[PDB]
């Protein structure tokens, strides 16, 4: 196939100006969408704080308005999803991947509103869920919308604009441009066959998305963890030990979410009213735990700098890990709109910090700072649960800027992804697309 390739190499990277320009506008809208979605989620969380003050004396009434405020916002989000867009439940990264396989539709006229407003409800009530899901799905659909509006033709544009949407979408959720592009290249593209996704364009989308986010967010970083210490070579083996711990825990956590989806589906059977009533009990629990023990609730970005700084006791870190594993399953397996990405960072950070603490006390000749082990384990559940280790690495790299930790991060990740493979685990986003594509056939 020599002379074909001779002509193919010659015709390499010449993305049609039409697709390049359309990725430019797609990134800009996904930018504004994620910016607005972010300001929105914050505003309800603030109102919710100011309500607990108008009632800061009658401690039971305090616990009540904390429950009901999140119950109401939760239910609203469940309903908006069951009634008008069922595939905007849960994360939504499984659907955008399916859409790249051409096995699920991009129903943009329905999802943009359902996800955006549905998420504002579940995130804004302080449920343990991430902005990733919402912005990723929302962003891909925004790409289809401009595909349809401008009626561009071809697989290139349909797969590209669908991709450049979800990349710029994950970028704007973490001020994380490189992580976004890498998310498509390692995790979201069609995994078993070639694709025409023009990377130069996904790139133009991520730039514009990131510039919009910088216009509304500069001077404040999502995670400021300072510059930590370096890692001596004779310490690396301790990070691989950490990865092995994640590698067996990774799939163990994947199993629970699948079965917990089942155990919660038994709760409502499929009945839109039992379901929405359940999410008000979940959301109300979260807005309640968010008052009485905030570390067990919320997205989890807040407790990351605190855990890295060694500011928790070892007991507290154990408590938090259990509790946050509990409230993470309750929220994500219920199907409420919102990603799982962000809260898995916290579960990872918390675990590493606990590991770094024990590592500090066993090896004073090593001169450890528990903080480096948090930064390594932060992207670790991403590796052992969703099996996109290269994406978690550049993600944590972008958010904490401790590049001198590049080796223990890479090493703990490969450790988690290898032991997750060898203990019979599956990439979480791909094992969700399955049971979805399998029920979307088992009905026949």
């Amino acid at each position: 196939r020599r002379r074909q390739l001779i002509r193919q190499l010659l015709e390499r990277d010449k993305t049609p100006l039409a697709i390049l320009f359309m990725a430019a506008v797609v990134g800009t809208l996904v930018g504004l969408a994620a910016v607005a979605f972010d300001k929105g989620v914050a505003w309800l969380q603030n109102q919710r704080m100011g309500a607990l003050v108008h009632t800061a004396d009658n401690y039971p009434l305090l616990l009540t308005v904390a429950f009901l405020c999140s119950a109401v916002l939760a239910m609203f989000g469940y309903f908006l999803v069951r009634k008008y867009a069922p595939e905007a439940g849960g994360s939504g990264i499984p659907e955008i991947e399916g859409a790249l396989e051409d096995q699920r539709p991009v129903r943009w006229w329905r999802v943009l509103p359902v996800k955006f407003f549905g998420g504002l409800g579940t995130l804004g009530g302080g449920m343990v869920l991430g902005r990733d899901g919402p912005t990723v799905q929302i962003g891909g659909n925004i790409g289809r919308m401009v595909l349809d509006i401008f009626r561009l033709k071809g697989d290139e544009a349909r797969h590209t604009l669908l991709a450049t949407g979800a990349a710029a979408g994950l970028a704007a959720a973490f001020n994380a441009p490189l992580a976004g592009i890498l998310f498509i290249i390692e995790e979201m593209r069609p995994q078993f066959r070639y694709t025409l996704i023009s990377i130069k364009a996904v790139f133009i989308g991520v730039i514009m998305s990131t510039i919009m986010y910088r216009i509304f967010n500069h001077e404040v970083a999502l995670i400021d963890v300072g510059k930590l210490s370096d890692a001596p070579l004779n310490t690396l083996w301790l990070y691989l030990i950490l990865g092995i711990i994640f590698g067996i825990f990774g799939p163990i956590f994947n199993k629970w979410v699948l079965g917990m989806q089942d155990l919660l589906h038994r709760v409502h059977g499929g009945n839109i009213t039992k379901w929405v009533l359940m999410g008000g009990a979940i959301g109300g629990l979260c807005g309640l735990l968010g008052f009485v023990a905030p570390a067990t609730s919320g997205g989890g970005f807040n407790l990351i700098p605190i855990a890295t700084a060694g500011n928790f006791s070892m007991g507290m870190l154990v408590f938090i890990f259990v509790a946050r594993v509990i409230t993470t399953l309750l929220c994500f397996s219920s199907g409420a709109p919102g990603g799982i990405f962000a809260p898995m960072l916290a579960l990872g950070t918390v675990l590493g910090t606990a590991f770094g603490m024990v590592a500090v006390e066993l090896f004073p000749q090593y001169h450890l700072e528990a903080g480096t082990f948090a930064i390594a384990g932060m992207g670790a559940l991403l590796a052992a649960s969703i099996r996109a280790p290269l994406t978690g690495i550049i993600l944590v790299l972008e958010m904490t800027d401790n590049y001198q930790l590049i080796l223990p991060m890479i090493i703990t990740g490969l450790g988690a992804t290898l032991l997750a493979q060898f203990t019979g685990g599956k990439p979480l986003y791909s094992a969700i697309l399955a049971r979805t594509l399998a029920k979307q056939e088992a009905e026949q």
Partner: antibody
Amino acid sequence: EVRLLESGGGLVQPGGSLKLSCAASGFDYSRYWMSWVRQAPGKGLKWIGEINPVSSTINYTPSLKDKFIISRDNAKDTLYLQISKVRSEDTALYYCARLYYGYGYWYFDVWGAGTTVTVSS
Amino acid sequence: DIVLTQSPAIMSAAPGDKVTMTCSASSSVSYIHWYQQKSGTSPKRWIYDTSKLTSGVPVRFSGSGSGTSYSLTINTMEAEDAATYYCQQWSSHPQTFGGGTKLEILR
């Protein structure tokens, strides 16, 4: 240059107390651990303790409770050692030192001139 | 903790000449460090990680060994090489120095 200059050493009565000071000049005094090592007259080098830049973990040799108090002032670029209940065993030349590493087995990177603590009545 | 006992407690040797001292440890030790103290001056870090020179240290110096026995050596000695050579470990905690080995010119 990189200079470690320590003062505070003198004559002290037994059971009294002294606070040696180590003054840093030529490098970022944070990001470095510091350490005190004393050398009894005509004897070997002895390790007192060490202290990490954030003052968050201080280690001392197997020696008593409040005997030694290592502390540091990153604003002032200065390292402190307080010896309490001074015996004649504490008569020695006290060295201030900055720590580093290579393969991760740590060493005593750059030392200072020293100060002398005499304990007699 | 880990006792280090340097061997030729005092010793002399003529200039341009091979010298060899020894560090010797009760338990096992990895990568030892060697400092040179001259009468009246701060100790100097001379050799680290079993084998590694420092900037300025002349290449007549060398370290070697393993486990529970290391050593410093001068292929051709000089005059400025007269000092005390202290070995020290941190493979284990807490770290420990040896007794010293005084190197004096022979004449």
